[PDB]
Amino acid sequence: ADDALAALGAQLFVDPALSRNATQSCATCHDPARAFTDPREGKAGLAVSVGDDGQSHGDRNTPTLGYAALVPAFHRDANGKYKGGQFWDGRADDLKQQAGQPMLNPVQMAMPDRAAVAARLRDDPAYRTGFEALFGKGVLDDPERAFDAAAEALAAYQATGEFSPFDSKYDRVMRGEEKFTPLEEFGYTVFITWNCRLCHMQRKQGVAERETFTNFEYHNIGLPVNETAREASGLGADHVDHGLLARPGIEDPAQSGRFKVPSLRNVAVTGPYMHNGVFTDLRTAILFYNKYTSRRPEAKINPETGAPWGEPEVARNLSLAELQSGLMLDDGRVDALVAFLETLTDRRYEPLLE
Amino acid sequence: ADDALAALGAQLFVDPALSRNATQSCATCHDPARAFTDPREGKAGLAVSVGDDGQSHGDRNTPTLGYAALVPAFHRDANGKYKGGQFWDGRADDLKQQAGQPMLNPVQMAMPDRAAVAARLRDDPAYRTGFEALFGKGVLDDPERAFDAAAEALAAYQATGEFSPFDSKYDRVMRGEEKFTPLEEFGYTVFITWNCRLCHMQRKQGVAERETFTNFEYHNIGLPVNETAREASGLGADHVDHGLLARPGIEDPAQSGRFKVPSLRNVAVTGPYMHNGVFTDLRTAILFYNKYTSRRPEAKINPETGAPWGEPEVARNLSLAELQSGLMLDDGRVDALVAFLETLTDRRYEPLLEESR
Amino acid sequence: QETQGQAAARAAAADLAAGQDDEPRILEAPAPDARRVYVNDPAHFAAVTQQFVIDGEAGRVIGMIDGGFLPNPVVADDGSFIAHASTVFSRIARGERTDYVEVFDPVTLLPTADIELPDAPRFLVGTYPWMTSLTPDGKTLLFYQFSPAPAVGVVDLEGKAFKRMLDVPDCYHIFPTAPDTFFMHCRDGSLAKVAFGTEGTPEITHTEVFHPEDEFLINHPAYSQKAGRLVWPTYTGKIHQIDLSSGDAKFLPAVEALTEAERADGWRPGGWQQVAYHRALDRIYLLVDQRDEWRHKTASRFVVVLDAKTGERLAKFEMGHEIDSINVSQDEKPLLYALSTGDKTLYIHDAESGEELRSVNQLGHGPQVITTADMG
Amino acid sequence: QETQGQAAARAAAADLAAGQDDEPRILEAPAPDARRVYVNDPAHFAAVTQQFVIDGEAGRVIGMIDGGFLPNPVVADDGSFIAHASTVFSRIARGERTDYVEVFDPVTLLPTADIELPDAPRFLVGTYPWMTSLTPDGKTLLFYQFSPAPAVGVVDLEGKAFKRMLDVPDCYHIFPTAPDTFFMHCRDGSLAKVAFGTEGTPEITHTEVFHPEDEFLINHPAYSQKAGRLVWPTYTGKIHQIDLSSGDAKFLPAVEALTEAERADGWRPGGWQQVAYHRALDRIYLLVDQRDEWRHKTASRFVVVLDAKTGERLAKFEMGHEIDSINVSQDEKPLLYALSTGDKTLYIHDAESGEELRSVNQLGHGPQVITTADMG
Amino acid sequence: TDPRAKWVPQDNDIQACDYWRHCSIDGNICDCSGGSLTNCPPGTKLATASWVASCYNPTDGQSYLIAYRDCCGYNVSGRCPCLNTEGELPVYRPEFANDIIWCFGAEDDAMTYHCTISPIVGKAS
Amino acid sequence: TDPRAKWVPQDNDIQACDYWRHCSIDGNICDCSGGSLTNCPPGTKLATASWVASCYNPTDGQSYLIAYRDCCGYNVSGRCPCLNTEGELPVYRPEFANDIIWCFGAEDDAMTYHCTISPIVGKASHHHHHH
Numbered sequence A: 001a002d003d004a005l006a007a008l009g010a011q012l013f014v015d016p017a018l019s020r021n022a023t024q025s026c027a028t029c030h031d032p033a034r035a036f037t038d039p040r041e042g043k044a045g046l047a048v049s050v051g052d053d054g055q056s057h058g059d060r061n062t063p064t065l066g067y068a069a070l071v072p073a074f075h076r077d078a079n080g081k082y083k084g085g086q087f088w089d090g091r092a093d094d095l096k097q098q099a100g101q102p103m104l105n106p107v108q109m110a111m112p113d114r115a116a117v118a119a120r121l122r123d124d125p126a127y128r129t130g131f132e133a134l135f136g137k138g139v140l141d142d143p144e145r146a147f148d149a150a151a152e153a154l155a156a157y158q159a160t161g162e163f164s165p166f167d168s169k170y171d172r173v174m175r176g177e178e179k180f181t182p183l184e185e186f187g188y189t190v191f192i193t194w195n196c197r198l199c200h201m202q203r204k205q206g207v208a209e210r211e212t213f214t215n216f217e218y219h220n221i222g223l224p225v226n227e228t229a230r231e232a233s234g235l236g237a238d239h240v241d242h243g244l245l246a247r248p249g250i251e252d253p254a255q256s257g258r259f260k261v262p263s264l265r266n267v268a269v270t271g272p273y274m275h276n277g278v279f280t281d282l283r284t285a286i287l288f289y290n291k292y293t294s295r296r297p298e299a300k301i302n303p304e305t306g307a308p309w310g311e312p313e314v315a316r317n318l319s320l321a322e323l324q325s326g327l328m329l330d331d332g333r334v335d336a337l338v339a340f341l342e343t344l345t346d347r348r349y350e351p352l353l354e
Numbered sequence B: 001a002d003d004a005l006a007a008l009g010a011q012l013f014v015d016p017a018l019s020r021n022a023t024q025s026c027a028t029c030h031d032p033a034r035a036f037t038d039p040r041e042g043k044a045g046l047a048v049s050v051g052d053d054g055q056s057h058g059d060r061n062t063p064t065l066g067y068a069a070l071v072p073a074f075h076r077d078a079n080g081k082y083k084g085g086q087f088w089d090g091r092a093d094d095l096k097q098q099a100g101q102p103m104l105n106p107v108q109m110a111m112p113d114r115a116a117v118a119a120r121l122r123d124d125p126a127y128r129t130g131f132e133a134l135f136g137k138g139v140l141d142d143p144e145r146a147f148d149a150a151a152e153a154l155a156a157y158q159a160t161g162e163f164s165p166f167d168s169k170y171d172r173v174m175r176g177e178e179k180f181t182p183l184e185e186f187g188y189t190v191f192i193t194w195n196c197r198l199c200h201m202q203r204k205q206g207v208a209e210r211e212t213f214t215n216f217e218y219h220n221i222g223l224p225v226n227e228t229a230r231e232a233s234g235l236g237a238d239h240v241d242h243g244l245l246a247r248p249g250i251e252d253p254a255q256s257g258r259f260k261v262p263s264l265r266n267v268a269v270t271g272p273y274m275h276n277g278v279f280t281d282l283r284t285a286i287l288f289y290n291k292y293t294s295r296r297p298e299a300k301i302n303p304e305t306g307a308p309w310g311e312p313e314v315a316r317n318l319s320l321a322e323l324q325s326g327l328m329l330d331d332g333r334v335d336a337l338v339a340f341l342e343t344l345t346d347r348r349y350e351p352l353l354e355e356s357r
Numbered sequence C, D: 001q002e003t004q005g006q007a008a009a010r011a012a013a014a015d016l017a018a019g020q021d022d023e024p025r026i027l028e029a030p031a032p033d034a035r036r037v038y039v040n041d042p043a044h045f046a047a048v049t050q051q052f053v054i055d056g057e058a059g060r061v062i063g064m065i066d067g068g069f070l071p072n073p074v075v076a077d078d079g080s081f082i083a084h085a086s087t088v089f090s091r092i093a094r095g096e097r098t099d100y101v102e103v104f105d106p107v108t109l110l111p112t113a114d115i116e117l118p119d120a121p122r123f124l125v126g127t128y129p130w131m132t133s134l135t136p137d138g139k140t141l142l143f144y145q146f147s148p149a150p151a152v153g154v155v156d157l158e159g160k161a162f163k164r165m166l167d168v169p170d171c172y173h174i175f176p177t178a179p180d181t182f183f184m185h186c187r188d189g190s191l192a193k194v195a196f197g198t199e200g201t202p203e204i205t206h207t208e209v210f211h212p213e214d215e216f217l218i219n220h221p222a223y224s225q226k227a228g229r230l231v232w233p234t235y236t237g238k239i240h241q242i243d244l245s246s247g248d249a250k251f252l253p254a255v256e257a258l259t260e261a262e263r264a265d266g267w268r269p270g271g272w273q274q275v276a277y278h279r280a281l282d283r284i285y286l287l288v289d290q291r292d293e294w295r296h297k298t299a300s301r302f303v304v305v306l307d308a309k310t311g312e313r314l315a316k317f318e319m320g321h322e323i324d325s326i327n328v329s330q331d332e333k334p335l336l337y338a339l340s341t342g343d344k345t346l347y348i349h350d351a352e353s354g355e356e357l358r359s360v361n362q363l364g365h366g367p368q369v370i371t372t373a374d375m376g
Numbered sequence E: 001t002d003p004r005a006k007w008v009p010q011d012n013d014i015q016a017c018d019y020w021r022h023c024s025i026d027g028n029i030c031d032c033s034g035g036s037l038t039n040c041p042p043g044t045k046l047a048t049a050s051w052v053a054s055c056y057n058p059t060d061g062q063s064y065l066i067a068y069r070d071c072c073g074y075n076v077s078g079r080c081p082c083l084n085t086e087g088e089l090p091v092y093r094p095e096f097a098n099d100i101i102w103c104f105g106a107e108d109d110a111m112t113y114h115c116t117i118s119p120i121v122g123k124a125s
Numbered sequence F: 001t002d003p004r005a006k007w008v009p010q011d012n013d014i015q016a017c018d019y020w021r022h023c024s025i026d027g028n029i030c031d032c033s034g035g036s037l038t039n040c041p042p043g044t045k046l047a048t049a050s051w052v053a054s055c056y057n058p059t060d061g062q063s064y065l066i067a068y069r070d071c072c073g074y075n076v077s078g079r080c081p082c083l084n085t086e087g088e089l090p091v092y093r094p095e096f097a098n099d100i101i102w103c104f105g106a107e108d109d110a111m112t113y114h115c116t117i118s119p120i121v122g123k124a125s126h127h128h129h130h131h
Ligand code: HEC
Pocket: A013, A024, A025, A026, A027, A028, A029, A030, A049, A050, A051, A052, A058, A060, A061, A062, A063, A064, A065, A068, A085, A086, A087, A088, A089, A095, A098, A099, A100, A102, A103, A107, A108, A109, A154
């Protein structure tokens, strides 16, 4: 059952047969060697990913799958804050619900429908054995059950310890196995006393058992459009990415421009950053937060472009209460934060830190 | 000497031979039956007095001579306050310096000069005898000496107990011989806790042995011109009574419009009030002070005229710090002050209160 | 006898043990109720002051309200709001004065109105509860002015605006009886009824003089607005009661709070809020002690409780502390609140037995005034 | 033997007996002199505060100044004025914040300037004398800003205007050396030298790092602006002295105010203004007692006096009270002022012998900061 | 020290609450914040208003009228607080009432209470 | 009551200054002015700034990160005043410093000090300067 389901998902995950031209698997964009993100250079660099047809670019940055299985299913909590879900806009409830969507998305894996997904599954004798042992005889002859089963296998694969090993230095330090360096401890202290912890910590107080450095909420931090990614996505220069509000069922205009607080785990190796991969450097992403706190000229300017950050793609619902902290991060605290953030790199990616 | 000098002054005081036409003695304007003030009606009522010529009117109200002998001689104290003196503008240093001035003032007793005064004193064998005994043979032949000796005699006479007997009800109550009526005691209490005490008490603190209800200072309380008196005196519609600034030797424009705080002894019997006799009633004089405190429109209206009090004659240097006390005297407190002030009447003028009351 | 602080520790340790999360946030005070008590600390004339909102049943501070110089607190009887008239200056105790009324939500304690009073018109005095007073409907606050003369200021709390000053005779304190009417106590020994409109000379009527000039009526009489009862001790513990419920003043018979023997042995009332009146029980409480006749503002260690109708003594409690002010909750089985200015402590007593139940200490610097709502 | 109050009673009785009159008025404080001491009461973070002006010789309060929230007092060494940077709010502790500098005439205590500081730029922190500082010419006040980042505000006392904010690095405190330069202590353990013109970024230079990360320099160094001597104790009673008197920082032998065996038997500096520096005597006074290592803000009952040159202990006084703060008058035969926050009492000591001469009690609620002028 | 005992005046210490002239003082003795028995501290503003009492002077066997005046425009001193009420009447007899902040007339409209002075203005009657 | 003696944390009364979480509190315990251990009283504004201390819980022998937060915009409560300084460092290490009025990020720009809450936000690590 649970091993075997996940092993099935493991097959599917790397199988380009689930793409129209059979040129792309999940693993093409969520490359395990790149904390399950897309190392492939496209028109907008690494901001966005290219689909199976070799032309179509998405309009959002491919996120890591690492630790995505710790995100609760999408729900509105008693304070009226939306939490959890999958995708940058929480439009998928959970992993299972998310898994079939790349397969059928014409700008990603581009399979025409569930039936064509099922037919590719029937081509492979290994799948007929694998899927039948777990979900019963004839499962692949029924497109719905086939596609749901593929989705469940994928979700189960993503829930394995491989995707969320909690073996970062931060983890070893919290178990008393290791000590942070001075700079990393400074970084941590800053992280938990400054505004970051207001959103990139699981809990408001007390101690999380499996901290993933997100509270799973939705916030508009006022980011600009990634012009070249937006050009590449072909959604047009008139387009506005409304974030959470694009989730079907969410109607509240207070949610326009809000995106899910990403886990900062492996953040050091999953550039570029933000939902549109607008920032190539981690340091830049940290610096962006100073635009709300710092009175200095250098705070209005994206150090990667030398030009002003740009106006928010969505100018309302900014989380100003959290972002206008009254204190700006000096260079040493930015260093400290980068250091701390790098401690959240899973063991197997520590080699990628250069 | 002291007895006899006073006794000479007594004779001079009531002697009309010291006026040009012999109609007028000190006692004519400073009538002993009226606490040494002028009961006579003139063209501005009792506000200002008429001289020996029968026509000339002063521009200021004739003040009492009672208790005038307690006033210190004119001086500037160390706080730059001027104090004491005689006349409403302190222009005389003391009683002696004051005493000759009515004699030679053409608006008053109108003798032409000291010589004419001496010639009068010589017509009288009792003066030859009285002056010679105290001042020596030939005194009446020397106009300067005779005039000075007459002033001295007159100052001596004003310093007698007859002028300052301290036998008012207030004095008897303070000795413990009687008590105030309850209205009087409230009046007394208000007097001593309100702004009256900042000006109408001898001392800033401690206890005066012989209280005369004045600090002898000079204060512009923002009085209007008394039009009728000012008309009668002939000084002109553009005339300004500068008060203390008129004293020769005072040049400080900050003294313009300040007058000597009067003793409030016999105040009940010595109306009309203020330096120009502008208010006829004692209660009005008290109510004037509410102009600086009360927010009620009535407080800006002279109850005697029904019209605004008027612009101050001198609109600068008002004593606003003391005046603008922030507290208005209700009518219970004005009644009480009247009752208290009436306790300041000397025993012999008690019978005059009936009419005032 | 497990304390506030001990129960909290226990509860917090359990949430940590259980991994229970909670959002740090701003608490709401519990709903106003009959056992809520307010203590104002005029802080011995300090420029700024504090009111403590207290759950008298628990003996717990549930909130605080900042104020200025000798503010006058009022508490709507029905619990809907609280307010005060207060005074601040631009540079602490000097510079431009601003008198103002704030109205506050009684659970969030947030100001819902801030209403300037023009020309700095408040009477600045050691706090007398009945020198600022709400009308029974809660819509108007009436504040006393002494300077330049006695006057009363009218503030519209519904429209959040100052209305007008009313000219009054030589009278003191403000006991409102209607949306447009209040009584004052006059120098002449009468009460003055003042009836006022949006404009015009108010209708002012005086009662008969009800005390001689040598009988001294204290500055802190008890007034139940809901009963229209004015309970007014003299210096000797003679208690005048005046029934204003009919809308006009009826003088009730005088009662002595102390006995003839007690009086001959030097017993007299004394403190600040010396007297309390429990509306439902029709009971007077009076802080008393043996004292010289001119030690009338000193604390007292004894509370006599007497039946308002008959004058019959019901109890004499030995408070066990130096008490300056008393008041009572207005519910059944009332608490008798005994505020010590010197201890800065509200002692909360059972008003039937006198037994001390609990206490709330650290109530500022010189707390003097207890206010409860009469919510029943 | 006869106290101030007693002598005053005899004088008043003589005046009454002699019939001596005298005008009630506002007194002028005695000319500022070496023995004037100021005690600031931050009042445990109260929204308004008090400064006491004390004549240390007679142990007499000779005046007071009111302040707002956590003001920074500065006293011009030449006695010509005092000033503070203060903070008020439009409704006690809430509403619009005004930061401002007041300058006062030191005999009339009247304010001679009130200069608004734009955009509420003051650092609100338990009071550190060297978070706001006069330049030696007295013409300029510099105040530290923490939010959004370390910065320093330049206030022209002569023009009576705020000029501008200087961007500094990650540093703290302000020790002006010249009309256009001051030093600050940096996170990285250097001092920074900051020279400002009328325009442009200032010029900033860093000394050598002079202490390790785990050596903790207290918030209250003693700085003698005239001697250019910055005296900077660490938590263990180790004392840096830095000489800024040539325009650049030079580091004097670090000295130890405690002995190894004292340390070992638990002696460490402790309190608020833990250190004083007497310029003419070149002598450091350090408050110390036996305390745990993290009780570094508690009162001490011992002062040790040590030569600044040698490090030699000249004296150890048993103060006979819980002392939070010390300072000294800067004249010959200096007083040693020992301020007890707890006792609200300034104990005035002969600095030579350490004996208690006299004391001034009732200094507010939680007095912490002693300032004197260096008039010599 | 027994608060309820009859007040016992003395004429030997003006900073003490039993000093004879303080028989109806309420607040703080100005002498303890830089004023004196009859003068205000620097920076404060002297009221012109007053309330009185008749205070027995055990030096001379005579009772004097003390017309107290407030020093205003400063927050309360906090030194030598006293409250005596010899002959003190309720607020409706304000001339003998001492809870009132008697700061009227003080320069600059000062109305905050700092401390009180105790000058003599007459002998009782 | 020996002010200089080592601090002896208890886990039995949050209103006492020896309560284990108050190990670097400076001011007043919010629980005494109508807040609670981790919530502000009514009327005040919770700051987003904090200083942190690693505080020893005597009960489980563990060290927890307390990120203190100020409740601002009221005058100081004056109830349950407390000043502890476990691991407290000078102002140039502001993250551990507790004389600072940490009212930054409070609603309405509230910057006046009323009281301090003592919530847990981690299980140390640790720190270097204070374990
Ligand atoms: C062509 C590139 C590409 C391929 C192939 C692809 N992904 Fe994604 N993945 C993305 C992008 C882009 C997003 C973010 C999309 C958005 O937010 O709308 C994403 C988001 C997700 C998320 C949500 C993660 C988060 O934190 O919100 C999950 C889970 C996921 N992908 C799983 C898969 C699986 C399983 C497959 C194989 C069926 C797959 N992906 C194939 C690009 C791809």
